[PDB]
Amino acid sequence: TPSLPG
Amino acid sequence: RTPSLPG
Amino acid sequence: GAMGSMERASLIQKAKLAEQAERYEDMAAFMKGAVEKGEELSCEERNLLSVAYKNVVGGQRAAWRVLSSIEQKSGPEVREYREKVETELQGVCDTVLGLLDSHLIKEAGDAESRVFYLKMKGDYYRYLAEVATGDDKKRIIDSARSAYQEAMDISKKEMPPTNPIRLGLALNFSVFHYEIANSPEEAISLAKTTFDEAMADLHTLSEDSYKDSTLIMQLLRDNLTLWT
Amino acid sequence: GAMGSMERASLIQKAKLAEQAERYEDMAAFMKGAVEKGEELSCEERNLLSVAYKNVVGGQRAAWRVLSSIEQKSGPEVREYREKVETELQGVCDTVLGLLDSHLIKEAGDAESRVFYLKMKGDYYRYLAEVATGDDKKRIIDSARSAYQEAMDISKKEMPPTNPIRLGLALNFSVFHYEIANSPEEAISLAKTTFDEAMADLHTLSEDSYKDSTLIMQLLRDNLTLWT
Numbered sequence: 001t002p003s004l005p006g
Numbered sequence: 007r008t009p010s011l012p013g
Numbered sequence: 014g015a016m017g018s019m020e021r022a023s024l025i026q027k028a029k030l031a032e033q034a035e036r037y038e039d040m041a042a043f044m045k046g047a048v049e050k051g052e053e054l055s056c057e058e059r060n061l062l063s064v065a066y067k068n069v070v071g072g073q074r075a076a077w078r079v080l081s082s083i084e085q086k087s088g089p090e091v092r093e094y095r096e097k098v099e100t101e102l103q104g105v106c107d108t109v110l111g112l113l114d115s116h117l118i119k120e121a122g123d124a125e126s127r128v129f130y131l132k133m134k135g136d137y138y139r140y141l142a143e144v145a146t147g148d149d150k151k152r153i154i155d156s157a158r159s160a161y162q163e164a165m166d167i168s169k170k171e172m173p174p175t176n177p178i179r180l181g182l183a184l185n186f187s188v189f190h191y192e193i194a195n196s197p198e199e200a201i202s203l204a205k206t207t208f209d210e211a212m213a214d215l216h217t218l219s220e221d222s223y224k225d226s227t228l229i230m231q232l233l234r235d236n237l238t239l240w241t
Numbered sequence: 242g243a244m245g246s247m248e249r250a251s252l253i254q255k256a257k258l259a260e261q262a263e264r265y266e267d268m269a270a271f272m273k274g275a276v277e278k279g280e281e282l283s284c285e286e287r288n289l290l291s292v293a294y295k296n297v298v299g300g301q302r303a304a305w306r307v308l309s310s311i312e313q314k315s316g317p318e319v320r321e322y323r324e325k326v327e328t329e330l331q332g333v334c335d336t337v338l339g340l341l342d343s344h345l346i347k348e349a350g351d352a353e354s355r356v357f358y359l360k361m362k363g364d365y366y367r368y369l370a371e372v373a374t375g376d377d378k379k380r381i382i383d384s385a386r387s388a389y390q391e392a393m394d395i396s397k398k399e400m401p402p403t404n405p406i407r408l409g410l411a412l413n414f415s416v417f418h419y420e421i422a423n424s425p426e427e428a429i430s431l432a433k434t435t436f437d438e439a440m441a442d443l444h445t446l447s448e449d450s451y452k453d454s455t456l457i458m459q460l461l462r463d464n465l466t467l468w469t
């Protein structure tokens with residue numbers, strides 16, 4: 001699952 | 007610049 | 014450290030040059046030197062620190078995942094090289110965590126910066142957890158959870174529910190619950206509550222804030238869809 | 242050295258893993274260690290060595306160009322940081338040239354290896370010339386010219402005009418003439434005669450050799466059509 005992209 | 011061999 | 018003899022303002026200037034040159038290890042080293050001067054960071058500087066180390070650790074995580082995939086499909090060489098990358102990644106995370114504990118978190122002068130740094134502490138323990146095993150992994154998981162939970166407590170008291178830093182914290186903490194702590198029900202509950210509490214206030218925001226907040230809300234939604 | 246206790250085959254295996262992980266600094270270090278075992282490199286191994294250092298120096302060159310452009314448009318910080326990147330670039334080129342002179346360039350050897358390494362020596366002196374100034378630049382330029390010229394003489398005697406190594410040497414030597422040595426007329430002539438002499442011999446090649454040769458011929462043509 002992706003986390004915050006920055 | 008002019009490109010050189012890419013490898 | 015190696016940056017001890019350079020002026021703080023020069024380190025910030027060179028971090029920005031390094032970013033332009035896509036030299037992220039240099040950027041991170043300059044920002045570490047700036048943090049070690051002992052003064053608080055502005056919002057722009059905090060973001061520079063985060064971008065620099067995210068690029069460094071992100072490359073190491075991607076390489077670790079490539080090598081772990083080859084290892085799982087598979088002499089000792091693949092394991093050895095995976096372990097080499099792993100040790101380097103752990104070193105970078107220990108460096109970031111050391112900056113946050115000495116002394117960014119305790120010197121943060123406002124709630125937003127304190128939440129930003131406690132979230133970052135949770136994130137870097139989470140990166141450690143991805144490669145940890147056994148009892149060390151269990152300790153790391155508890156450390157991540159404690160940092161994230163402290164950030165959550167502050168953000169609920171001090172920041173509105175649409176605040177982008179608060180939303181991003183909840184996004185990453187919910188990812189931690191799902192991907193690391195094997196707690197999908199906690200992940201879903203947190204993402205859902207965060208999404209609903211932000212939605213209630215969307216009509217009070219400007220055009221820009223609405224975009225900012227729904228952007229991260231959409232990131233919560235993607236995870237909920239994958240999870241639900 | 243840090244690789245001295247590792248088996249040659251393990252170094253080569255790890256160089257290949259490093260390439261898959263896009264860890265080119267590691268890849269180059271593994272291949273350096275392999276070279277230092279003192280055995281000739283196979284064709285595949287020469288290509289690994291070349292790809293590794295190409296990517297390392299390529300990132301440094303790109304960063305140097307960014308910083309040099311900022312410097313030309315413009316405290317001491319931009320110059321200092323450009324100088325730092327420049328010194329690291331020169332260090333890598335000196336490492337490569339050292340490996341070539343101490344281990345790899347021999348009077349013995351097949352034409353394929355001798356031309357490959359002399360071309361490489363020309364290339365890494367060319368990269369030093371890109372950042373050099375004044376009389377130092379003149380000497381470096383002559384070192385590159387001498388290496389390329391020796392490779393050219395061997396290639397014309399010992400290889401067919403379609404040989405891909407011969408073609409890539411002519412491509413890079415013509416780039417040297419155009420970009421470094423202020424000799425665009427020579428660059429154009431070399432690219433044209435090389436292309437034409439390869440064209441005329443394509444009929445001797447298999448489907449596979451034809452694709453290998455024509456891909457490099459296409460690069461020569463791209464430069465010719467750019468320059469004329």
Ligand SMILES: *N1CCC[C@@H]1[C@H](c1ccccc1)c1ccccc1OCCOC
Pocket residue numbers: 004005006059060063064177178181
């Ligand atoms: N991620 C956390 C801190 C750096 C990075 C920020 C970000 C980028 C894209 C999407 C979400 C967060 C970030 C980087 C550079 C400038 C501004 C940034 O966001 C600051 C506040 O937004 C969360």
Ligand SMILES: *N1CCC[C@@H]1[C@H](c1ccccc1)c1ccccc1OCCOC
Pocket residue numbers: 011012013287288289291292405406409
């Ligand atoms: N460049 C010089 C030697 C390594 C690299 C080779 C190359 C790649 C792409 C375009 C031209 C040359 C190369 C790398 C890996 C495998 C095979 C390779 O080329 C062999 C023929 O070189 C002329």
Ligand SMILES: [Cl-]
Pocket residue numbers: 093094097255
């Ligand atoms: Cl290793």
Ligand SMILES: [Cl-]
Pocket residue numbers: 027321322325
């Ligand atoms: Cl510097």
Ligand SMILES: [Mg+2]
Pocket residue numbers: 245246247
């Ligand atoms: Mg030994």
Ligand code: NA
Pocket residue numbers: 248249
């Ligand atoms: Na051995």
Ligand code: NA
Pocket residue numbers: 465466467468469
């Ligand atoms: Na043209």
